[PDB]
Design a protein around this ligand. Structure first.
Ligand SMILES: [K+]
Ligand SMILES: [Mg+2]
Ligand SMILES: [Mg+2]
Ligand SMILES: [Mg+2]
Ligand SMILES: [Mg+2]
Ligand SMILES: [Mg+2]
Ligand SMILES: [Mg+2]
Ligand SMILES: [Mg+2]
Ligand SMILES: [Mg+2]
Ligand SMILES: [Mg+2]
Ligand SMILES: [Mg+2]
Lengths: 59, 185, 144, 134, 260
RNA sequence: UAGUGGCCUACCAUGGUUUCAACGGGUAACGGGGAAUAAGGGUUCGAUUCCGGAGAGGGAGCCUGAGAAACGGCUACCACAUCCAAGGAAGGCAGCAGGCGCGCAAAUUACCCAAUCCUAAUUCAGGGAGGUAGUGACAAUAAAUAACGAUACAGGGCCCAUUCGGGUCUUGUAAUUGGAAUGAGUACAAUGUAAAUACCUUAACGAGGAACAAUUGGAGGGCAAGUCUGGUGCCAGCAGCCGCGGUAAUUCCAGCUCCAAUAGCGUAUAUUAAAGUUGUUGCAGUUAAAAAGCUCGUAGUUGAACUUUGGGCCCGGUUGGCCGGUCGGAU
């Protein structure tokens, strides 16, 4: 209805972010290797179930 | 204005994409057999589906029917040949009750591992793509290759390549050269 | 009986009855009248280029509160004036006036999305570059 | 260079074109490729001919090395091979030689200019002398 | 489309020539000649595809212009000459004589014959009527006009032909008990004895045909071709002899050959 | 007229089609083989590789010829456009390539008759038919991006069970160290080809993780994966839908971590299934949408029962037999 709203704040919060940079961490494998990595984590070693498996558990 | 060259999709994606029970059971198979993708599992589900469809369409027809007798035996022998279907089961009924792992167990990758040779499915994929293992005479660098039961004895390392015979590789021929020139003047 | 003719020689009635009742379906009626061509800004095409005339700050619908950033566009093919949403944070900065935009649909078969009143389209590209690419900062917005 | 070997399969006697035609299987372990000018002479030995009568073509190597199947044929005489073989095959052996054509565009272009010119074009070229000044 | 078509696309070819789909785009269009287009086999197909003598359509012309090959005792220089059923292809070099005859799948066989047999061919008589100056003639299936025939000869009878002369040596009446070659349909290439003929005025006559293993079948009279008496073929038949085995029975006869 | 026929002319009759939908209008309609989706039944698509038709800016006319109402033939008119010394002349890419325009929307003004076949007076000539390469993430197939040691370092299997834990059988994690394996690439030379190019083959050369470095989308629910950290404070923004955001944001912008599919993944529009939400199979109609105010009635659809039934014979068939006897087939 009101089409004449202020356009001034456009791009506020993207401009207001502190530009933290990505950590140069070691690269994970690709292809069949990564599917092996997933299988070891998910099934073989057995993650610490608190009733059920998590994935991405908190501290 | 050539003839059309035909082609076909070899797989089928599942209907509901985030079923947890499936996703677990799929990664079980990608682990056990050392498969790259879910697409490799989907490939075998699709081949099983065409087989099961074929058998269902014959079991509707009466026993002692030409098309049943002919194609039924042809389907059975074709499975028996690749060693998916065992020698005891040759009814047609038994080809219906036939799981996905019963195809996976006969591909090269696993059949290399199961005959010694590697020590792991993950090693076997390497050996195959690295052109080491060879079926009877010639090299096969396709892990998908379904071994045909009259070829399983004849699997060995190639006449070309190390392990089997021949020159001792690329890295060895550099690593032999560096130690040799260091020792000599 | 079940209120429909069952007779062996009743195929005519069954076929004709079903034809008449298919006009009650939404998709069928649109497909046969040819609404997509006749009305419909894009003329039954997935996308359309247009020229930005304006920048609009459309107040959102309730119970949300926001000024959603939009552009009044005139399409090259028809001359049909249309409002399009400019998605992602601070992407209205990239557009400017008299800049050629490629519009797309919003996802809802010509219905308005979310809380944005009267907006059935979105910007995809400005002056031949992707709004995604400009906002991830891969390409640069050209001189004109 | 071990073994080398050569073997002709599916040998048809062909009186019509006056040749023996056959599939040239080539069990070559621990090599890369026998050349065409190499198969010919080895086959000229077995079939008792000169190299100019022998022909060989279409040698696809096997995957993973070893064999290299192809197709070979041996005519009765040289004169018989010269008439029946295609020119392109003879050039590879070095019996015929490449006649130097122009490009197709030029031959075509030339033909279209000549379509304009009726007759031999002697009296036309005479009027060109008095075209600059009538 | 304005006038007659000079090409034929590879897919629109007769299936029974067994042309490969990829290598090409056109196929050899039979010239006008004795046999119908779809019922013929061009020489280029016979030489290149079936006997494997030529490798290209250039080599087929190289062979034809030497003046070796001759169809019914006369030399031909046309790559797409429409040779057909009962024709005798004679090569001078090799001294191989063949007769084109259908195997059971419904395709022309490589059927080598002796030089004696190559003297003649059979000819199904198509029409028999009175020509100019009252001279009667017959018309064979390969379109040969033959004048002054035996008045016993009626339509659908076969007629033995001398080739060199091109005269009626002998003929076979169409009746019950005669051996037959079926020259079209689902049962193209089968051989068998006539049982009875169904009439149907202003329509299509049908011919019930038993064979040696007691399998009846019906064809149209247009597809039938008399080739002798019961167990007395005038020509030599190919391997099989127009039997038609099941796909099962065929697969069992492979397992005999599989032993080696 | 090649020939049948209102095909046309003369004369005569008054017929011909239609609610079993004529006639008219629309079609973002060339038809078919087919394609997509597919429990069964269906629904949607088919400009497009084969077959048939029509057209060559729009109309009409016509010469030649067996064959054309031909357009890489002519003639005229209409529209558009080219050169001119202004008197005149020459035009037709819905062939190949290419350009402009149009637009969401699509390639080189390349090489060749070697293959496929076609034409001619014709083994030779010609062929942008056609083939070969270039461009090409349309779609489809296969399928790298690591593998294996040994100390290592958390343990978990069972056996010393002394409370020392023997590293017992091995499984993970360390920016810890080992020798191997390799085509991606570059490149002898062959092979390949009309000539190449590329595969295929192959000398020589070519992985140490900082490199030869996988992405695209998500992480409240639907839906697989975090009430972890920093920012903003109903703003910016997200959100197919439900909903988030007004100072601890599980949802926004980011970092970390994790999920999913992966050389692909997302978005838009259309379409199929899901849809028994088009219902023949197979829906619903008291009150959710919907039984005509009532009856008559033509087409349509539908329409009770009844007419040689039973009995006695006889002859060949096809499977299991019963002794399949050698675990397979025989009478
Ligand atoms: K979840
Ligand atoms: Mg045409
Ligand atoms: Mg149209
Ligand atoms: Mg079409
Ligand atoms: Mg159109
Ligand atoms: Mg035009
Ligand atoms: Mg025309
Ligand atoms: Mg015209
Ligand atoms: Mg033109
Ligand atoms: Mg033309
Ligand atoms: Mg309902």
């Amino acid at each position: 209805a009101k089409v004449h709203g202020s356009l001034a704040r456009a791009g506020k919060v993207k401009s207001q972010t502190p530009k933290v940079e990505k950590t140069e961490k070691p690269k994970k494998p690709k292809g069949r290797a990564y599917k092996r990595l997933l299988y070891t984590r998910r099934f073989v070693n057995v993650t610490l179930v608190n009733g059920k498996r998590r994935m991405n558990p908190g501290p | 204005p050539r003839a059309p060259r035909t082609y076909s999709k070899t797989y089928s994606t599942p209907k509901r994409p985030y079923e947890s029970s499936r996703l677990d059971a799929e990664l079980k198979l990608a682990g056990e057999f050392g498969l790259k993708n879910k697409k490799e599992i989907y490939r075998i589900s699709f081949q099983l589906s065409k087989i099961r469809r074929a058998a269902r369409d014959l079991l509707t027809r009466d026993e002692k029917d030409p098309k049943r007798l002919f194609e039924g035996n042809a389907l059975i022998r074709r499975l028996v040949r690749v060693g998916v279907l065992s020698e005891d089961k040759k009814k047609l009924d038994y080809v219906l009750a036939l799981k996905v792992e019963d195809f996976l167990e006969r591909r090269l990758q696993t059949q290399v591992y199961k005959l010694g040779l590697a020590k792991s499915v993950h090693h076997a994929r390497v050996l195959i793509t690295q052109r080491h293992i060879a079926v009877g005479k010639q090299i096969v660098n396709i892990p998908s290759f379904m071994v045909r039961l009259d070829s399983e004895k004849h699997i060995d390392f190639a006449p070309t390549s190390p392990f089997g015979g021949a020159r001792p590789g690329r890295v060895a021929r550099r690593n032999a050269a560096r130690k040799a020139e260091a020792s000599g003047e | 009986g079940k209120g429909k003719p069952r007779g062996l020689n009743s195929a005519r009635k069954l076929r004709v009855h079903r034809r008449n009742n298919r006009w009650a379906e939404n998709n069928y009626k649109k497909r046969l009248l040819g609404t997509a061509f006749k009305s419909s800004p894009f003329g039954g095409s997935s996308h359309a280029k247009g020229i930005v005339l304006e920048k609009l700050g459309i107040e959102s619908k309730q119970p949300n509160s926001a000024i959603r950033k939009c552009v009044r566009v005139q399409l090259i093919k028809n001359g049909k004036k249309v409002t399009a949403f400019v998605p992602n944070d601070g992407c209205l900065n990239f557009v400017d006036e008299n800049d050629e935009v490629l519009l797309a649909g919003f996802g809802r078969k010509g219905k308005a999305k979310g809380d944005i009143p009267g907006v059935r389209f979105k910007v995809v590209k400005v002056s031949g570059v992707s709004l995604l690419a400009l906002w991830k900062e891969k390409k640069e917005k050209p001189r004109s | 260079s071990d073994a080398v070997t050569i073997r002709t399969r599916k040998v048809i006697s062909n009186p019509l074109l006056a040749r023996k035609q056959f599939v040239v299987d080539v069990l070559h372990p621990n090599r890369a490729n026998v050349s065409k000018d190499e198969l010919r002479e080895k086959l000229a030995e077995v079939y008792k001919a000169e190299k100019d009568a022998v022909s060989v073509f279409g040698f696809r190597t096997q995957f993973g090395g070893g064999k290299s199947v192809g197709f070979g044929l041996v005519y009765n005489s040289v004169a018989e091979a010269k008439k029946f073989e295609p020119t392109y095959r003879l050039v590879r052996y070095g019996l015929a030689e490449k006649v130097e054509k122009a490009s197709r565009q030029q031959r075509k272009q030339k033909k279209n200019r000549d379509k304009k010119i009726f007759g031999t074009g002697k009296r036309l070229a005479k009027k060109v002398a008095r075209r600059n000044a009538d | 489309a304005r006038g007659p078509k000079k090409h034929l696309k590879r897919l629109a070819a007769p299936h029974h020539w067994l042309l490969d789909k990829l290598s090409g785009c056109y196929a050899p269009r039979p010239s006008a000649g004795p046999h119908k287009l779809r019922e013929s086999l061009p020489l280029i197909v016979f030489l290149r595809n079936r006997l494997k003598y030529a490798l290209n359509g250039r080599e087929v012309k190289a062979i034809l212009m030497q003046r070796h090959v001759k169809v019914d005792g006369k030399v031909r220089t046309d790559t797409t000459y429409p040779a057909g059923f009962m024709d005798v292809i004679t090569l001078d070099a090799t001294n191989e004589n063949f007769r084109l005859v259908y195997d059971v799948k419904g395709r022309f066989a490589v059927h080598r014959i002796t030089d004696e047999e190559a003297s003649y061919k059979l000819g199904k008589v198509k029409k028999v009527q009175l020509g100019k100056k009252g001279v009667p003639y017959v018309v064979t299936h390969d379109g040969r006009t033959i004048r002054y025939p035996d008045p016993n000869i009626k339509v659908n009878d076969t007629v033995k032909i001398d080739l060199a002369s091109g005269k009626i040596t002998d003929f076979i009446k169409f009746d019950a008990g005669k051996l037959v070659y079926v020259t079209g349909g689902r049962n193209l290439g089968r051989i068998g004895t006539i049982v009875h003929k169904e009439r149907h005025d202003g329509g299509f006559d049908l011919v019930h045909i038993k064979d040696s293993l007691d399998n009846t079948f019906v064809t149209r009279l247009n597809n039938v071709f008399v080739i002798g008496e019961q167990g007395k073929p005038y020509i030599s038949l190919p391997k099989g002899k127009g039997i038609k085995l099941s796909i099962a029975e065929e697969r069992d006869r492979r397992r005999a050959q599989q032993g080696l």
